[PDB]
Amino acid sequence: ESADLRALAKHLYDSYIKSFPLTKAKARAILTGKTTDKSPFVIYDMNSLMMGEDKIKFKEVAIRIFQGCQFRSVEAVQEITEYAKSIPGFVNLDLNDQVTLLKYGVHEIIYTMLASLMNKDGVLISEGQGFMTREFLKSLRKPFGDFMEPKFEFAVKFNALELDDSDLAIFIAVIILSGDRPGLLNVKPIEDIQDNLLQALELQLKLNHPESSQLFAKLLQKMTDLRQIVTEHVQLLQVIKKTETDMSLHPLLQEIYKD
Amino acid sequence: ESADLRALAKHLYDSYIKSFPLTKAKARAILTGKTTDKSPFVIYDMNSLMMGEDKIKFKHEVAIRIFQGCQFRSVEAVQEITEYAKSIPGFVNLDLNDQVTLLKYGVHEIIYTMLASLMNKDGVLISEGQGFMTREFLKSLRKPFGDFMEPKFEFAVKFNALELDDSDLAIFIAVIILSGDRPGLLNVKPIEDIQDNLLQALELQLKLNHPESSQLFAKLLQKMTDLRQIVTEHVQLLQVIKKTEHPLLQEIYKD
Ligand SMILES: O=C(Nc1ccc(Oc2ncccn2)cc1C(=O)O)c1ccc(Cl)cc1Cl
Ligand SMILES: O=C(Nc1ccc(Oc2ncccn2)cc1C(=O)O)c1ccc(Cl)cc1Cl
Ligand SMILES: *c1ccc([N+](=O)[O-])cc1C(=O)Nc1ccncc1
């Protein structure tokens, strides 16, 4: 029955709100200059970077940004981990598979939600209190500059779809419950949850964006871009973990990089 | 109006069978030896335990392994309780931060209430009721593990003395979730408005379902002293387990 899938969509959306404090709706308000939200300090140089430390409460500039990009990743993973548990059936799976779904789904999800925080010019940081321009980033020291260029590339293509949070909730869910993840012990129960999620996504996309021809198809196709962006970054780290063997990587993030 | 109260009582029971796989009626059937159709594999010592893994297919040190398997069923319960709560009238209309707060502080109290339905004087149904772990085998676990679940056992025999059925626990569970005294709520009025409704239904339900049982309502609300006291003890023993014992799993099982 059509209407049973609406229940699952509203369920996922509700957990998304509960699990992700910086929704895309909050981000697009900050980024357009709405009055529901307040204005961010923008850093495009070492001066504002250093006035950023003063104004923005947070915790070489090229590594200290990265050390900051890192603790934030940890928080996102913890946030996505909390969201997964809410997906019906996920906690009932084999525990080695739950773990394996999180280890591979997390990066594809990080970059999907990072899109919500980007425009063509830059990205909100520190819960929206900050904004870092694409240019300041591409202008960092030789292994750290290119690091964030392709994420900006994907968000432009992805943000084109004009998804809102209620769509992303279900899409995020589909990403976790994949089944072609390597090492999975029982693909079948994963595949039946995802079959249900895609059904829910399909109805959701068609009702929430009724004039958007093949948005479902276009959206599923975007998992190609996510797959590529992740591998590009996994190699990119490997350069840094050995350019600076004096830069330490957070253990949770490391456990999600079996190379 | 009592016809409205019954309506809500039946609403909740229906939702309680939808949400919770192993009902207390079911758990009783297995435990008594009445329904002899499927009888659960029993774990009474180390040898039976190691055979138990090959028959029951758990999805997860023997004592350390049992604790972790207890943790796995914990996050499953949470998700069933969360799904159940949504079906309590007015729950979802609450401030979303208030819902997360009620659930956050209420899942444990509900976990042990419902654990009591799977227990008796000699042990507990485990897995989906296809196991049974004897209490004496749990007592025999290396410290501090062997004394972890012995306090829960004496709550359950006291709790089960009330002889509550699933339709009672349905409403009783609802009352626990709508506790307007949880740390950091934002709008206590609707929470207490629902709870006084839920208490009214519970009251009329106990009286109709147990006219024999004098003041069972009052006896029931007094047990929520034993619940809060169990929980506060339980939080503390898994903190000295935190000094006795990966990272991804550590995130699924956060406190
Ligand atoms: O910089 C990013 N994130 C953060 C970096 C530093 C930080 O803390 C910080 N900020 C400025 C200077 C030092 N540290 C917080 C964040 C965040 O997103 O929360 C970032 C986000 C998206 C992309 Cl594509 C790239 C980056 Cl480099
Ligand atoms: O045994 C219990 N929980 C489980 C522990 C392990 C487990 O899986 C398992 N079984 C045997 C050995 C290791 N792991 C499944 C359960 C369950 O309740 O479903 C249990 C139930 C009630 C109480 Cl008071 C204590 C425990 Cl330890
Ligand atoms: C077992 C082990 C750890 C925790 N905890 O971290 O709070 C809880 C439990 C437990 O009692 N789990 C359980 C719930 C419902 N039915 C059976 C077992």
Numbering used by the authors:
A (entry chain A): 207 to 265, 276 to 475
B (entry chain B): 207 to 266, 276 to 460, 466 to 475
Paper passage:
To visualize the ligand cobinding poses, we first crystalized complexes of PPARγ LBD covalently bound to GW9662 or T0070907, which produced solvent exposed active (chain A) and inactive (chain B) helix 12 conformations similar to apo-PPARγ LBD, then we added synthetic ligands to the crystals using soaking methods. The BVT.13 cobinding pose is similar to its orthosteric binding pose located near the β-sheet. However, the 2,4-dichloro group clashes with the orthosteric GW9662 and T0070907 binding poses, specifically the phenyl and pyridyl groups respectively, resulting in a slight reorientation of the 2,4-dichloro group to accommodate the cobound state. For BVT.13, the covalent ligand cobinding pose is similar to the orthosteric binding pose. Each of the non-covalent synthetic ligands utilizes unique mechanisms to cobind with the covalent ligands, as inferred from our crystal structures in which pre-formed crystals of the PPARγ LBD were soaked with non-covalent synthetic ligands BVT.13 cobinds to a region of the orthosteric pocket that only slightly overlaps with the orthosteric covalent ligand binding pose, adopting a cobinding pose that is similar to when soaked into apo-PPARγ LBD crystals. MRL24 and nTZDa, which are the most potent non-covalent ligands tested, pushed the covalent ligands into different non-natural conformations, whereas BVT.13 and SR1664 do not. Although these covalent ligands have similar pharmacological functions to orthosteric non-covalent antagonists and inverse agonists, GW9662 and T0070907 function through a different structural mechanism: they slow the rate of exchange between transcriptionally active and repressive conformations natively populated in the apo-LBD, with T0070907 having a more pronounced effect than GW9662.
